[PDB]
Design a protein around this ligand. Structure first.
Ligand SMILES: CNCC[C@@H](Oc1ccccc1C)c1ccccc1
Ligand SMILES: [Cl-]
Length: 549
């Protein structure tokens, strides 16, 4: 039997916590400003209701209806079972560096427990004479940038991706602690991992409100707020704004990676999935908008304090460089540093728990031995993640982290989600999915949702896929250029998950017995309906099914 959530509130908190993560607080705030201002909101909202909510709701419906993980849920059409393996591997890839992004915040929180913060000004061992303090004197030479790039990452010792050095004894301890906490928050199941979400998905909102209350009443935050909401429709007539909105919507709503299906597998049949999807999606967008409102309030204050136009202060390490230098100037710097970094720790842990849960359930459902000895399989997966993340904490840790960030979660998963949409709308049948959703609650999906899932979501996602490959810029870090074998390895990593779909397609084709027609029918019909193959009642071969909306 499935563990099953103990409360709809716990399930909603888990899903909303997985949705809102560091991206929602670090990307959208300045993505709304990279454009002309305001012209990004319209595409953001439009793409939300057109593809981000429909695809999110479709993913949630599959898990609840079929009660399976990320790979086993493709029993409805085994040809695409490779999609589950691809998404599982991509989740395992992303975790490697997401844990390090959490470890940095842990280190910052530990370093924040002093009356005098270590990033106030120069004079420490890790600060070069070339430093320049704005208060001590009338652009990586600022005290905060120097702290981040020498006292945390120790980049000065590194020289490139080919020269990574050895792991740092401090980040080693930090990553060990965070990984141990993650393992102890998942070693039992949803009975335990659902309890810790009550705090990890609620602390960020309390911290955000506390920070907004102060930020609104600041000497120069009004300028930042008006700049954040500067209405301007001239930029809407471009293509970069639409591409940015599409990619941001896809990569926050969370649809795909294989964590929404995992969570929805633990729900009951009489749960209102159509309402839960709308709740989660609306909360995500509202949190992003308020997060931008809060984020630019402090950038405006810093701009006013420095007496420089906001374009100058406008800017992975943005939250590790901008704010640490901003909080120091405020009253109660020690009071606010701890809170701000605890918020980042909550965001990161809350996302990582969901990712690891998705991988764990996806593999356990496939393998009953692991489903039984989960207490050992979780340790195995966590230790593999720790060993592979050991590389992303060396002296040149940021280089490898950037490579993984731009190659793992990219076209590799963008194609997987397109495969899931295709295999759900065309092969399985949008009418069949609507019938299943009706069997779940009682009211069929609206014609608008039906028209979305079949034509709009696949076209949208294919558009993003084709855009994110032709416009692939060469891999660079600020000013350092990567060697050719670095890009070769990045492409290999990205393609390792892409190749998993066709390889399994051919594997199933060869394994299945019979003639070509029999093999094709068996590979598309669900296991329970396989008996119809002998009777020759395959709906995929009828034009009516293909032309059914
Ligand atoms: C909600 N934002 C997405 C969360 C997060 O999902 C994770 C994180 C770690 C391991 C596994 C997964 C699926 C993610 C982060 C950055 C790029 C893509 C996904
Ligand atoms: Cl977003």
């Amino acid at each position: 039997p499935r563990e099953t959530w103990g409360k709809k509130i716990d399930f909603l908190l888990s899903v909303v916590g997985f949705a809102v993560d560091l991206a929602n607080v670090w990307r959208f705030p300045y993505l709304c400003y990279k454009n002309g201002g305001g012209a990004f909101l319209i595409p953001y909202t439009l793409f939300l209701i057109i593809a981000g909510m429909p695809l999110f709701y479709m993913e949630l419906a599959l898990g609840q209806y079929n009660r399976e993980g990320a790979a086993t849920v493709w029993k409805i059409c085994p040809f695409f079972k490779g999609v589950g393996y691809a998404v599982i591997l991509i989740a395992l890839y992303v975790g490697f560096y997401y844990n390090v992004i959490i470890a940095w915040s842990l280190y910052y929180l530990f370093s924040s427990f002093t009356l005098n913060l270590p990033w106030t000004d120069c004079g420490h061992t890790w600060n070069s004479p070339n430093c320049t303090d704005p208060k001590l004197l009338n652009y990586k030479f600022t005290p905060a940038a120097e702290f981040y790039e020498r006292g945390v990452l120790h980049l000065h010792e590194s020289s490139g991706i080919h020269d990574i050095g050895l792991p740092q004894w401090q980040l080693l301890l930090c990553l060990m602690v965070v990984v141990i906490v993650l393992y102890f928050s998942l070693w039992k199941g949803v009975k335990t991992s659902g309890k810790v979400v009550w705090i990890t998905a609620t602390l960020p909102y309390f911290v955000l409100f506390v920070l907004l209350v102060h930020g609104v009443t600041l000497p120069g935050a009004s300028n930042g707020i008006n700049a954040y909401l500067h209405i301007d429709f001239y930029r809407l007539k471009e293509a970069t704004v639409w591409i940015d909105a599409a990619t941001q919507i896809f990569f926050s709503l969370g649809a795909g990676f294989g964590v929404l299906i995992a969570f929805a597998s633990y729900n009951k049949f009489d749960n209102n999935c159509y309402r839960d999807a709308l709740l989660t999606s609306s909360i995500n967008c509202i949190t992003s908008f308020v997060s931008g409102f809060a984020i630019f309030s402090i950038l405006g204050y810093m701009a006013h304090e420095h007496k420089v136009n906001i374009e100058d202060v406008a800017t992975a390490g943005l939250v590790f460089i901008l704010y640490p230098e901003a909080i120091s100037t405020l009253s109660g710097s020690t009071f606010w540093a701890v809170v701000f970094f605890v918020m980042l720790l909550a965001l990161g842990l809350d996302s990582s728990m969901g990712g690891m849960e998705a991988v764990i359930t996806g593999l356990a459902d496939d393998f009953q031995v692991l489903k039984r000895h989960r207490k050992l399989f979780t340790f195995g997966v966590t230790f593999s993640t720790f060993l592979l993340a050991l590389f992303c904490i060396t002296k040149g840790g940021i280089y490898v982290l950037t490579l993984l960030d731009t190659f793992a979660a990219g076209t590799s998963i963008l194609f997987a989600v397109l495969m899931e949409a295709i295999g759900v709308s065309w092969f399985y049948g949008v009418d069949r999915f609507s019938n299943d959703i009706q069997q779940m609650m009682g009211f069929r999906p609206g014609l608008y949702w039906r028209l979305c899932w079949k034509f709009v979501s696949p076209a949208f996602l294919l558009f993003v896929v084709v855009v994110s490959i032709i416009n692939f810029k060469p891999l660079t870090y600020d000013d350092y250029i990567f060697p050719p074998w670095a890009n070769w390895v990045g492409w290999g990593i990205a393609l390792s998950s892409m190749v998993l779909v066709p390889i399994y397609v051919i594997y199933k084709f060869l394994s299945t017995q019979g003639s070509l027609w029999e093999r094709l029918a068996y590979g598309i019909t669900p296991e329970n309906e396989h008996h119809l193959v002998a009777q020759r009642d395959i709906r995929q071969f009828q034009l009516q099914h293909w032309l059914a909306i």
